[PDB]
Amino acid sequence: KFKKVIWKSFL
């Protein structure tokens, strides 16, 4: 799995 950033969703 990728530990990318979920900032797009947080915004």
Side-chain angles (χ1 to χ4, degrees):
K1 241 157 92 151
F2 302 90
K3 65 257 293 224
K4 295 162 119 210
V5 188
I6 318 92
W7 175 234
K8 50 241 287 168
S9 316
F10 271 54
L11 227 180

